[PDB]
C-alpha cells in the first residue's frame, strides 16, 4: 500500500456490499440507459447506443482529446459502442472492431445507426494474437478489474505492450489504462508518452469503483501528477456525503448509410439511360440524389420514397412443436430462425455479398472458357434447335399457375399475372418494349431486388430474389424460354444436367456417376456463385445466339446485351427520412429471371468443371496464356472425351458433383479461382476433399442412402441431418396466422416426410402423428422447401401410400419390378445406426417416452383444433 492509488484500493476492498454499491455512483456522471435498452430489446437498430461506451467516448471526442479519422481499429469492441459512435464521425472512413466472443464476453450487436455500413464488427478474435495492420485511429477499452492491483498491473502492461505494436507517429488513440497508479504501469506509461505523446485523462462517466484513466492522443500532462490527483479525488469520495450520480442524456447515434467516395463502376449510360429516366419521371415527386448512398461496386443513379417491405419476425409452428417435444432441448432445432427481409436486413447482405468485385480472368483462362462454351453450345444443340416461345405458351403458363420466376404485375393496372395476360393493354406495353428491343433499345427491363425469406440457423439477413416486370419476363421467355421449354439441360441432352429430375431420383443419378471409374467424388460449393459471374461468362453464355437466326437472334441479343450485361436494379434502403428505393446498376453478376438463371448457371458450371478436369489432367499448363499447341490439345480433349467427362458430373445450378479421372483434380485450382468461382469455407489454395462413399456426397442440400426393401428391391432415398428437417418444420412462414393455416403447413411437412423421409424412424412417427392430429379432409398449405427439384407430390389429400407407390414404384425409372406395396409396414427404415448417424433420437429414453405417449400429444393438438373428422395413422 505504498502509492496513494494502492491506499485507495485497500480502502475500496474493505467496503461492504452496500457501501461499495453506494460509493460506486457518488458524484459521478451517468447515462440513463433505460430507453436504449428497451428500444434495442424491441428490435430498434436506429438512434440507440449499444452500451454506456458511446457516451464515454463522446466525452473525449467532444473535448478534442481524441479525433477519430480514416481507418479506425477498435480493440475489444464488445457490443460495438465505440465503433458505432465512430461510424457517424465526419472524418472517419472505415471502422474495424475486433472482440473475443463466447461465454462471459459481450457479442457485437447489429445496428443501423449513422454510418453503420462503414463498421465491420468481428467476434472470436483474441486481439493479443492478431497481426497489427495499418490504421489512422487505434481505440482500446481492454482491462478486467481485480481486487489485486498487481494482477491489474500485469493485465494493463499486457494491453500497453499490445497497443504499442499498432501505434505509429500519426496514430490518433484512446486507450484504457485499467490500473494507472502501479509503479510498473507509471514507468511503461512514461516511456509511451515520451514517444507518442498524449496524456492520461479521467472520464467523469467512469464509476468510483475503478481507477481507469484513458491515454488520449491530443491531451498533455504529467503522468504522476495526473494519477495522484485522481487517487486523491477517489479517496475523498469515500467520506463525502453521498451525492447522487449526475444524470447525463444518452447519445443519439442517428440512422442511415454513409458514402466515403469509393465508386468502382463505370455504367454504360447509353444502354441504361432510358430505364433510369423513366423511373426518374415516374417518381419526380420524391426523386433525389442521396450523397450518403452505400454503393461501392454498383453505380448509383438516385432514390425515391417507398413503403417498407419484408419482415424480421419468425413464428413457431405450434402443431409441429407439440408433436416433437424431445427436440425442444436441441439447439440445432430451436435456434432455427427466419431471415430478415426488411430494408436493413437486405442492405446488410448487399454490403457483405453483393457489393463485391470479381477480378478480370487472365488471357489463357478467357481462351479456355471461350473454346469450352463454343463446344458446349454445339453439344447441347446437336439434338435440339433454338426456337421462339409464344404469347399463347406464356398465357397457358400463367393460367395453369405453372413455374414462372419472381414477377411484378403493375398493382394499379392489374392485380395478378392472370388478370394482366387476359388484357390486350398488357400486350400493347409488351409490343412497345419488343419494338425498342428490335432497335437495340431498352426502357422497362429493370429488376426489383427483394429479400428472400429462408429458414437458417441464425436472426440472419436475407438473400436477394430479382423480380422482373411480367412484360420483361415475357420478352425473356420468348427469346430464351426454349432452354427450359425444350429441356436443353436435361440429363439426356446435357450429360451433366439434372433438369426435370425430382429431388428423390437425384440419388440414383449420383449412384450412376459413382459406377464410373475414377477418383473420389467432389462436391465443392462456390461462395455466392451469382455474384461471381463475370462479363466473360455473360459473353460466353450469349454465344447460344450463334445457333439462332433473324428476328430470334436480334431479340435474344437484346436480352443478353441490354438486360443481362447492363442491369438496372431497384433496391430498398432505410434512411433518416424513411425507406427509399435506390436505382443502381451493374454490368457483370447474375441478374436474369429465376428459370433462365438455372439454365445459364448449369451451362457455366458444366464449362467451369470441364476446365477444372482439363487442369487436373494437365491438358494446359498455365492460365496466363494458352499456347497454339494447348488450344489444339483443349479442342481435341473436348472433341475426344468431352461427352464422357460431362457424364462424370451431376450439375444442378451452381451445385455440382464431379467424379474426375483421378484425384489430381483436388489441387487443380488456378483456373477455378481465376474464373472467379472461388470455393466456400476453404482457403483459396487448400486442396479439395472428396468422398469415397457416394451415399455421403452432398447434392441439392441432401445425401442419398441405398435402402433394401423386404422383397429385395433397392430404393435410393434422399436424406439430411434430422435437426435441419425438424427445425425447419417448426418455423411458420411470416407472422399473424390462424391455427387452420398452421396445421395445413405442418401437414405439408408431415406428408413431405412420408414421401421422402419415411426411412427416418422419428420422422415417420412425427409425420403420422401430424396427419392424425390434423383433420383428414384439410388440404396441405404453403411451401416446405424452395428447392427447384422439389416435386411437391405431398401437396394432396390423396392417400399417401397411393402417392408413395406412384413416386417410388410406378413412375420410378430405377424400379424394374412394378409390384405395389400393400402397406406402410412393408416400407423400410434405414438401419438403426445409419438413422442415428443422421440425427435420430432412437435409442434415447426421452424419445421412447415420446413414442409411447404420442396419443396424448395427438389429442392435445386435436383439442386445440376442435372436434372434427380425424383418422388414426398410428
Ligand atoms: C469494456 S468492454 C468495451 C466496451 C466497448 N468499447 C463498447 O462501447 O461497447 C471490453 C471488451 O473487450 C473484450 N475483450 C477482452 N479481452 C479481449 C481480447 N484479448 N481480445 C479481444 N477482445 C477482448 C471483452 O469481451 C469486452 O467486451
Ligand atoms: Zn427492355
Ligand atoms: Zn442420412
Coordinates of N, CA, C and O and ligand atoms in Angstrom, one line a residue, residues 50-57 74-83 98-102 104-107 122 125-130 140-144 158 162 176 212 214, ligand 1:
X50 N -25.3 1.0 -28.2 CA -25.4 -0.4 -27.7 C -24.9 -0.6 -26.3 O -25.2 -1.6 -25.6
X51 N -24.2 0.4 -25.7 CA -23.7 0.4 -24.4 C -23.4 1.8 -23.9 O -23.7 2.8 -24.6
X52 N -23.0 2.0 -22.6 CA -22.5 3.2 -22.0 C -21.3 3.8 -22.7 O -21.1 5.0 -22.5
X53 N -20.6 3.0 -23.4 CA -19.3 3.3 -24.1 C -19.4 4.4 -25.1 O -18.4 5.1 -25.3
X54 N -20.5 4.5 -25.8 CA -20.7 5.6 -26.8 C -20.6 6.9 -26.2 O -20.0 7.9 -26.8
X55 N -21.2 7.1 -25.0 CA -21.3 8.4 -24.2 C -19.9 8.6 -23.7 O -19.4 9.8 -23.7
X56 N -19.2 7.6 -23.2 CA -17.8 7.6 -22.6 C -16.9 8.1 -23.7 O -16.1 9.1 -23.4
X57 N -16.9 7.6 -24.9 CA -16.1 8.0 -26.0 C -16.4 9.4 -26.4 O -15.4 10.2 -26.7
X74 N -10.7 -0.7 -33.5 CA -11.3 -0.8 -32.1 C -11.0 -2.1 -31.5 O -11.6 -3.1 -31.9
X75 N -10.0 -2.2 -30.6 CA -9.6 -3.5 -30.0 C -10.4 -3.7 -28.7 O -10.4 -2.9 -27.8
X76 N -11.2 -4.8 -28.7 CA -12.1 -5.2 -27.6 C -13.4 -4.3 -27.7 O -13.8 -3.6 -26.8
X77 N -14.0 -4.4 -28.9 CA -15.1 -3.6 -29.3 C -16.4 -4.0 -28.5 O -17.3 -3.2 -28.4
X78 N -16.5 -5.2 -28.0 CA -17.6 -5.7 -27.2 C -18.9 -5.6 -28.1 O -18.8 -6.0 -29.3
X79 N -19.9 -5.0 -27.6 CA -21.2 -4.8 -28.3 C -21.0 -3.8 -29.6 O -21.8 -3.9 -30.5
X80 N -20.0 -3.0 -29.5 CA -19.7 -2.0 -30.6 C -20.0 -0.5 -30.3 O -20.1 0.3 -31.2
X81 N -20.1 -0.2 -29.0 CA -20.4 1.2 -28.6 C -19.4 2.3 -29.1 O -19.9 3.3 -29.5
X82 N -18.1 2.0 -29.1 CA -17.1 2.9 -29.6 C -17.1 3.0 -31.1 O -16.9 4.0 -31.7
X83 N -17.3 1.8 -31.7 CA -17.2 1.6 -33.2 C -18.4 2.3 -33.9 O -18.1 3.0 -34.9
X98 N -12.7 -5.5 -33.3 CA -12.3 -6.9 -33.0 C -12.6 -7.2 -31.6 O -12.2 -6.4 -30.7
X99 N -13.2 -8.3 -31.3 CA -13.6 -8.6 -29.9 C -13.6 -10.2 -29.8 O -13.8 -10.9 -30.7
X100 N -13.3 -10.7 -28.6 CA -13.3 -12.1 -28.1 C -14.7 -12.4 -28.0 O -15.4 -11.6 -27.3
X101 N -15.3 -13.4 -28.5 CA -16.7 -13.6 -28.3 C -16.9 -14.5 -27.1 O -16.3 -14.3 -26.0
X102 N -17.8 -15.5 -27.3 CA -18.1 -16.6 -26.3 C -18.5 -16.2 -24.9 O -18.8 -15.1 -24.6
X104 N -19.1 -15.3 -21.1 CA -18.6 -14.2 -20.3 C -18.2 -12.9 -20.9 O -17.9 -11.9 -20.3
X105 N -18.2 -12.9 -22.3 CA -17.8 -11.8 -23.2 C -18.9 -11.4 -24.0 O -19.7 -12.2 -24.6
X106 N -19.0 -10.0 -24.2 CA -20.1 -9.4 -25.0 C -19.9 -9.6 -26.5 O -18.8 -9.6 -27.0
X107 N -21.0 -9.9 -27.1 CA -21.0 -10.1 -28.6 C -21.4 -8.9 -29.3 O -22.3 -8.2 -28.9
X122 N -16.2 -7.9 -35.5 CA -15.7 -9.3 -35.6 C -15.5 -9.9 -34.2 O -14.7 -9.4 -33.4
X125 N -12.1 -13.2 -31.8 CA -10.8 -12.6 -32.0 C -10.1 -12.3 -30.7 O -10.6 -11.5 -29.9
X126 N -9.0 -12.9 -30.4 CA -8.1 -12.6 -29.3 C -7.1 -11.6 -29.9 O -6.3 -12.0 -30.6
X127 N -7.3 -10.3 -29.5 CA -6.5 -9.3 -30.1 C -5.0 -9.4 -29.8 O -4.2 -8.9 -30.6
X128 N -4.6 -10.1 -28.7 CA -3.3 -10.3 -28.3 C -2.5 -11.2 -29.4 O -1.3 -11.2 -29.4
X129 N -3.3 -12.0 -30.2 CA -2.7 -12.8 -31.2 C -3.0 -12.4 -32.7 O -2.8 -13.2 -33.6
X130 N -3.5 -11.2 -32.8 CA -3.9 -10.5 -34.1 C -2.7 -9.8 -34.7 O -2.1 -9.0 -34.0
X140 N -8.8 1.2 -27.8 CA -8.7 0.0 -27.0 C -9.3 0.3 -25.6 O -8.9 1.2 -24.9
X141 N -10.3 -0.5 -25.3 CA -11.0 -0.5 -24.0 C -10.9 -1.8 -23.2 O -11.8 -2.2 -22.4
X142 N -9.7 -2.5 -23.3 CA -9.4 -3.8 -22.7 C -8.8 -3.5 -21.3 O -7.9 -2.7 -21.2
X143 N -9.3 -4.3 -20.3 CA -8.8 -4.2 -18.9 C -9.8 -4.7 -17.9 O -10.7 -4.0 -17.6
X144 N -9.6 -5.9 -17.4 CA -10.5 -6.5 -16.5 C -10.1 -6.3 -15.0 O -8.9 -6.5 -14.7
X158 N 0.2 -5.7 -20.3 CA -0.1 -6.6 -21.5 C -0.9 -5.8 -22.6 O -0.5 -5.9 -23.8
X162 N 0.6 -4.5 -26.3 CA -0.2 -4.7 -27.4 C -0.5 -3.5 -28.3 O -0.2 -3.5 -29.5
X176 N -7.7 2.6 -22.8 CA -8.0 2.4 -21.4 C -6.7 1.9 -20.6 O -6.1 0.9 -21.0
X212 N -9.5 3.5 -13.6 CA -9.1 3.6 -15.0 C -9.0 5.1 -15.5 O -9.8 6.0 -15.1
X214 N -7.7 7.2 -19.3 CA -7.5 6.9 -20.7 C -6.3 7.6 -21.2 O -6.1 8.8 -20.9
Ligands
LIG1 C1 -15.1 -2.6 -21.6 S1 -15.6 -3.6 -23.0 C2 -15.6 -2.5 -24.3 C3 -16.8 -1.5 -24.4 C4 -16.9 -1.0 -25.8 N1 -15.9 0.0 -26.1 C5 -18.4 -0.5 -26.0 O1 -18.5 0.7 -26.0 O2 -19.3 -1.4 -26.2 C6 -14.1 -4.5 -23.3 C7 -14.3 -5.7 -24.2 O3 -13.1 -6.4 -24.6 C8 -13.3 -7.7 -24.7 N2 -12.0 -8.5 -24.7 C9 -11.3 -8.8 -23.6 N3 -10.2 -9.4 -23.8 C10 -10.1 -9.4 -25.2 C11 -9.1 -9.8 -26.1 N4 -8.0 -10.4 -25.7 N5 -9.3 -9.7 -27.4 C12 -10.5 -9.1 -27.8 N6 -11.5 -8.6 -27.0 C13 -11.2 -8.8 -25.7 C14 -14.3 -8.1 -23.7 O4 -15.1 -9.2 -24.1 C15 -15.2 -6.8 -23.6 O5 -16.5 -6.9 -24.2

